[PDB]
Design an enzyme around this catalytic site. Structure first.
Site, PDB file in Angstrom:
ATOM      1  N   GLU B  88      -5.711  12.682   1.372  1.00  9.41           N
ATOM      2  CA  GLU B  88      -5.164  11.353   1.127  1.00  9.41           C
ATOM      3  C   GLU B  88      -4.229  10.986   2.294  1.00  9.41           C
ATOM      4  O   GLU B  88      -3.589  11.856   2.895  1.00  9.41           O
ATOM      5  CB  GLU B  88      -4.390  11.354  -0.255  1.00  9.41           C
ATOM      6  N   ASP B  92       2.928   9.688  -2.487  1.00  8.79           N
ATOM      7  CA  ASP B  92       4.238   9.078  -2.740  1.00  8.79           C
ATOM      8  C   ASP B  92       4.653   9.393  -4.175  1.00  8.79           C
ATOM      9  O   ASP B  92       5.344  10.384  -4.411  1.00  8.79           O
ATOM     10  CB  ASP B  92       4.177   7.566  -2.465  1.00  8.79           C
ATOM     11  N   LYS B 120       5.716  11.503   1.244  1.00  9.41           N
ATOM     12  CA  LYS B 120       7.005  10.870   1.020  1.00  9.41           C
ATOM     13  C   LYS B 120       7.624  11.683  -0.109  1.00  9.41           C
ATOM     14  O   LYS B 120       7.465  11.326  -1.290  1.00  9.41           O
ATOM     15  CB  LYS B 120       6.900   9.401   0.631  1.00  9.41           C
TER      16      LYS B 120
HETATM   17  N1  LIG Z   1      -2.688   0.653  -1.409  1.00  8.83           N
HETATM   18  C1  LIG Z   1      -2.667   1.668  -1.875  1.00  8.83           C
HETATM   19  C2  LIG Z   1      -2.467   3.103  -2.327  1.00  8.83           C
HETATM   20  C3  LIG Z   1      -1.077   3.289  -2.888  1.00  8.83           C
HETATM   21  N2  LIG Z   1      -0.729   4.626  -2.427  1.00  8.83           N
HETATM   22  C4  LIG Z   1       0.174   4.473  -1.344  1.00  8.83           C
HETATM   23  C5  LIG Z   1       1.093   3.277  -1.495  1.00  8.83           C
HETATM   24  N3  LIG Z   1       2.233   3.544  -0.617  1.00  8.83           N
HETATM   25  C6  LIG Z   1       3.328   4.231  -0.833  1.00  8.83           C
HETATM   26  N4  LIG Z   1       4.124   4.249   0.219  1.00  8.83           N
HETATM   27  C7  LIG Z   1       3.466   3.573   1.159  1.00  8.83           C
HETATM   28  C8  LIG Z   1       3.832   3.208   2.534  1.00  8.83           C
HETATM   29  O1  LIG Z   1       4.844   3.532   3.070  1.00  8.83           O
HETATM   30  N5  LIG Z   1       2.918   2.422   3.280  1.00  8.83           N
HETATM   31  C9  LIG Z   1       1.675   2.015   2.693  1.00  8.83           C
HETATM   32  N6  LIG Z   1       0.817   1.219   3.481  1.00  8.83           N
HETATM   33  N7  LIG Z   1       1.315   2.357   1.359  1.00  8.83           N
HETATM   34  C10 LIG Z   1       2.294   3.112   0.608  1.00  8.83           C
HETATM   35  C11 LIG Z   1      -0.086   5.258  -3.593  1.00  8.83           C
HETATM   36  C12 LIG Z   1      -0.071   6.754  -3.371  1.00  8.83           C
HETATM   37  P1  LIG Z   1       0.795   7.585  -4.767  1.00  8.83           P
HETATM   38  O2  LIG Z   1       2.058   6.810  -5.105  1.00  8.83           O
HETATM   39  O3  LIG Z   1      -0.111   7.528  -6.001  1.00  8.83           O
HETATM   40  O4  LIG Z   1       1.151   9.030  -4.454  1.00  8.83           O
HETATM   41 MG   LIG Z   2      -5.507   7.146   0.315  1.00  8.37          MG
END
Ligand SMILES: NCCCN(CCn1cnc2c(=O)[nH]c(N)nc21)CCP(=O)(O)O
Ligand SMILES: [Mg+2]
Ligand SMILES: NCCCN(CCn1cnc2c(=O)[nH]c(N)nc21)CCP(=O)(O)O
Ligand SMILES: [Mg+2]
Ligand SMILES: [Mg+2]
Ligand SMILES: [Mg+2]
Ligand SMILES: [Mg+2]
Ligand SMILES: [Mg+2]
Lengths: 177, 177
Positions: B88, B92, B120
Site C-alpha cells: 500500500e 494511516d 504515518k
Molecule cells: N484516497 C485514498 C486512500 C485513503 N488512504 C490514505 C489517505 N491518506 C492518509 N494520509 C494521506 C496523505 O498524507 N496523503 C494522501 N494523498 N492520502 C492520505 C487511507 C489509508 P488508511 O487510513 O486506511 O490506513
Molecule cells: Mg493504496
C-alpha cells in the site's frame, strides 16, 4: 543474453524510457492547445490492467516532467466521469486490436472531449481488424515477449527490459501444468 | 526553495525512496530465502491496493526482481499455499489494510505480510504494524509517488507536503460548481 530465461533482449529499460520521452514531447505538443491543468482539467489516463501498470507508472511521471498533468483510472483487460475530458488510453501491447477497439468504443459512450491511445508495444502484423494507435513506443514482429509489465502465466512482469522468452520456458510450463 | 510551486516541502525524493526500497528489498530477499521463490512455480504474490499504490508497486517489483525475489501481481480496489505481500502506498488509520489482510487470510495463503511506502505512525485508529516500511512521515498531508489530492498530483516524482493554497483554492472552486 543477460537473462537465462530469455533468448534476447529487445528493448532495455533505458531504451524504452528514451522512446517514452520522445512520445511525451509529442503528447505535450499535441495537447498544448487544450489548457490542461491539475484538478480543473487533467488529461485522464485510462490504464488497462494488469500489464500496463509498469508503463503507466513510468509514463505519467515522464508526462509530468513535460508539463502534462494527469489523473489515472484503471480498467481490467479480462473485462474485454470522463464526459468533456480528454482521455488517453494506455495499453502494454497492441496485437489483434480486439481489446483496444472494445475499450475505446466503450469509453466513447461517455462522450469524452477526445480519446487517443498510447501503447508500449505494437505488433502491427497481428491485427484482426484495422487499428492505429496515435502513439507507439516500440514495434515488435511475430515473437512472444515478456517484461516491462508483460507476463507469461503471470510471471516475468517485473523484468526491467522487454525480452523474448525462451521456448524452453513455456513449453516446459505447459507440460507441467 | 522548494522546486514545486504547489508544495511547501519535499519530504522524500524519488532517489531517496528508491534507496530505501533497495534496503527493504534486501530484507525481503533474506526473509524469504527459505521459501524457494521461483517464477511460475512459486512467485511471491504481490497484492497492490489501488489506486495510489500503482507507482510504488511498479518500482518495487522491479527492485525485488533485482534482488532475486520473483513476483506475480494482483490489484485490489487463488492464493492458498502461496506467500502474499500486500503493498500500500500509505498506511494511516490502518482500517484499509486491516480489512485487506483479514480478507486474504480467509484463503489460507502460506503467509501474509505487508509493505508500505509511507507509514504515518501517528494516524492509527486501530493497532497495526506493517512488516516492511520504506519511509515514515509525520501527521501532514502529502502527495506524489502515487498519492493524490482529488485525483491529481500522483505523478509527482517526490513525496511533498501540499501547499494549503492548493486545496483552499480548489475547495472554493468546488463549492462554486
Ligand atoms: N484516497 C485514498 C486512500 C485513503 N488512504 C490514505 C489517505 N491518506 C492518509 N494520509 C494521506 C496523505 O498524507 N496523503 C494522501 N494523498 N492520502 C492520505 C487511507 C489509508 P488508511 O487510513 O486506511 O490506513
Ligand atoms: Mg493504496
Ligand atoms: C491477451 C492480452 N493481450 C496480449 C496478447 N499478446 C499478443 N502478443 C503478446 C506478447 O508478445 N506477449 C504477451 N505477454 N502478450 C501478447 C492481448 C491484446 P490484443 O490481442 O487484444 O490486441
Ligand atoms: Mg532519453
Ligand atoms: Mg513518436
Ligand atoms: Mg492488455
Ligand atoms: Mg493478457
Ligand atoms: Mg487518495
Amino acid at each position: 543474453c543477460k537473462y537465462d530465461f530469455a533468448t534476447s533482449v529487445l528493448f532495455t529499460e533505458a531504451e524504452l524510457h528514451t522512446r517514452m520521452r520522445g512520445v511525451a514531447q509529442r503528447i505535450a505538443d499535441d495537447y498544448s492547445n487544450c489548457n490542461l491543468k491539475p484538478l480543473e482539467n487533467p488529461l485522464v489516463i485510462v490504464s488497462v490492467l494488469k500489464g500496463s501498470f509498469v508503463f503507466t507508472a513510468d509514463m505519467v511521471r515522464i508526462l509530468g516532467d513535460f508539463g502534462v498533468p494527469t489523473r489515472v483510472e484503471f480498467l481490467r483487460a479480462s473485462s474485454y466521469d470522463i464526459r468533456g475530458k480528454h482521455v488517453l488510453v494506455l495499453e502494454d501491447i497492441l496485437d489483434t486490436a480486439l481489446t483496444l477497439r472494445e475499450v475505446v468504443d466503450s469509453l466513447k459512450k461517455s462522450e469524452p472531449a477526445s480519446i487517443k491511445t498510447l501503447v508500449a508495444i505494437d505488433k502491427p502484423g497481428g491485427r484482426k481488424i484495422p487499428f492505429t494507435a496515435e502513439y507507439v513506443v516500440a514495434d515488435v514482429p511475430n515473437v512472444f515477449v515478456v517484461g516491462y509489465g508483460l507476463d507469461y502465466d503471470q510471471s516475468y512482469r517485473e523484468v526491467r527490459d522487454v525480452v523474448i522468452l525462451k521456448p524452453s520456458v513455456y513449453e516446459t510450463w505447459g507440460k507441467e501444468l
